[PDB]
């Protein structure tokens, strides 16, 4: 009854949706995650396309709703709603988002072949998910959240992933649910179940195996990282107050070497910063260490117009200035402005693809601003030729709850799938350092006013996901979708 039309097997989609969180963030059970997937696969079994969007939508609603219920809180306390309506904006969204889950389950109900399912069709549900995820990441800003993959952060395929990122752990996830599921129909047939335990328990073993493996080299004698965070909510007459207490938090540092201050950091412009900066930058020259902070970068255009970016600067014993490059839709600018903000009645702009790295110590810097730490693709161009992984954002806007944990798994992978050693500087949310297999050695306590203390060692050599990126995986997801497609054409 679990395949077959109307709402038992719609609400049984929810609680299996709903066990996205639970795999995921403090909790990280990852055989939860094995659970979700299989029972859509199974309850996707015999339904026509016109009850099959639904179930995508009624498990991408319970993904979504759970797994993302610290967006009500970011609504309620920062987005001044009642419990009312913060509750119908929240359900807005999870409804609207849902459909990521719901479009590839209707193309699944017209890509899927029960016939041969026993094979084909698990090979053809990972490839569909991996689609799916990767569609998720781009689609209008992309939306890289609860991917299956991050389950296995600290779980047995850990190994596989720096060979093939977050993308490949997702991917065998899928698998691996999808053939439990044929598992019984298997059996009688000797070749095709031996076949299938192969494609089952092959990955899993590979796992273990490349679990811990050094793929990068030593590339010298480590750095002491000092980040200072403050607990600055919503707040131009305390622009002083900022100024004053990040440095009088640096100047007592010694035996420093790296210096990091979170986003907009400083909240005036590194203009009108020269300076404040210039006199920072000698107190990090006689403590031998480079000040890594985030500003707003301002750009005078030939007009009578200010372009204005959101950056990191590197000041005393390094250099450049980087800016964002994605910003976040509606908070850092208006999508479709002549249009929607006609119907807001909001400040950034795109920062180019052609920057370089931040160099600090003679070693290079991949910067990340906020969450561009999510986008796996995008942030494996500036993991590769960078020694140290340095990301600096601001998680108040998310919120009190669970916001930060699950920014924190993607930033922790982002460590494990380039081997590199993360910096990471939050102006409240979680402050620490990661090393290169995904581990948190340092963290100091969110929601106050800390300085964490600790020590990085830049990274060389590569991670084979840093060299071939997901194309090869993405490349034979689509043989086996084309398998599938014309496997239903040909019948």
Same mark, same amino acid.
């Given at each position: 009854?679990?395949?077959?039309? %109307? ?35 199974? %309850? ?27 967006? *009500? ?7 001044? &709603?009642?419990?009312? $309506? ?31 399912? !026993? ?38 395929? &850990?190994? =596989?992933? @720096? ?5 490949? +752990? ?13 598992? !019984? ?15 089952? =328990? ?7 195996? $490349?679990?811990?493996? &050094? ?26 107050? #900022? ?23 400083? !909240? ?5 910063? +020269? ?7 000698? /107190? ?21 117009? +200010?372009? *204005? ?21 509606? %908070? ?19 920062? @180019? ?13 991949? @910067?990340?601003?906020? *969450?561009?730490?999510?986008? !796996? ?7 590769? #030729? ?42 409240? %949310? /979680? ?13 100091? @306590? ?9 020590? /990085? ?7 084979? *996901? $840093? ?14 979708? $084309? ?6 054409? =040909?019948?």
């Amino acid at each position: 009854w679990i395949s077959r039309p %109307g709402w038992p097997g719609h609400l049984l989609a929810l609680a299996a949706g709903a066990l996205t969180p639970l795999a995921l963030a403090p909790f990280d059970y990852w055989p939860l995650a094995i659970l979700s997937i299989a029972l859509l696969y199974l %309850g996707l079994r015999g339904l026509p396309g016109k009850s099959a969007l639904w179930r995508g939508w009624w498990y991408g609603f319970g993904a979504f709703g759970a797994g993302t219920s610290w967006i *009500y809180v970011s609504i309620h306390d920062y987005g001044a &709603a009642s419990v009312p $309506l913060a509750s119908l904006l929240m359900l807005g969204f999870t409804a609207g988002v849902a459909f990521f889950f719901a479009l590839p389950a209707w193309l699944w109900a017209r890509c899927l072949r029960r016939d041969n399912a !026993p094979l084909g069709d698990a090979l053809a549900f990972a490839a569909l998910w991996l689609a799916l995820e990767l569609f998720r990441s781009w689609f209008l800003t992309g939306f890289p959240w609860l991917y299956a993959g991050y389950s296995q952060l600290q779980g047995p395929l &850990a190994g =596989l992933v @720096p060979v093939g990122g977050v993308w490949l +752990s997702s991917f065998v996830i899928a698998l691996s649910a999808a053939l439990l599921v044929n598992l !019984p129909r298997l059996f009688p047939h000797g070749a095709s179940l031996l076949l299938g335990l192969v494609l089952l =328990l092959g990955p899993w073993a590979a796992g273990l195996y $490349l679990k811990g493996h &050094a793929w990068t080299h030593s590339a010298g004698e480590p750095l002491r990282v000092v980040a200072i965070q403050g607990n600055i909510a919503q707040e131009p007459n305390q622009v002083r107050a #900022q100024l004053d207490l990040y440095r009088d938090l640096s100047l007592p540092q010694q035996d420093v070497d790296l210096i990091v201050w979170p986003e907009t950091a400083v !909240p005036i412009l590194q203009d009108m910063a +020269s300076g404040y900066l210039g006199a920072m930058g000698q /107190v990090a020259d006689e403590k031998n260490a480079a000040l890594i902070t985030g500003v707003p970068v301002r750009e005078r255009l030939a007009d009578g117009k +200010s372009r *204005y970016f959101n950056g990191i600067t590197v000041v005393g014993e390094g250099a450049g200035t980087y800016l964002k490059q994605k910003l976040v839709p509606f %908070g850092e600018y208006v999508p479709l402005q002549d249009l929607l903000r006609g119907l807001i009645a909001s400040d950034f702009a795109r920062g @180019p693809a052609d920057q370089p790295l931040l160099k600090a110590k003679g070693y290079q810097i991949a @910067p990340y601003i906020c *969450y561009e730490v999510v986008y !796996p693709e995008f942030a494996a161009a500036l993991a590769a #030729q960078s020694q140290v992984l340095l990301t600096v954002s601001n998680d108040t806007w998310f919120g009190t709850s669970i916001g930060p944990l699950q920014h924190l798994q993607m930033a922790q992978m982002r460590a494990l799938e380039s081997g590199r050693w993360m910096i990471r500087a939050t102006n409240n %949310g /979680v402050t620490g350092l990661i090393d290169p297999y995904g581990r948190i050695v340092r963290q100091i @306590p969110q929601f106050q006013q800390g300085i964490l203390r600790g020590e /990085v060692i830049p990274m060389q050599g590569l991670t084979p *996901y $840093l060299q071939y990126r997901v194309w090869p995986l993405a490349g034979l997801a689509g043989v086996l979708l $084309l398998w599938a497609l014309l496997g239903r054409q =040909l019948r």
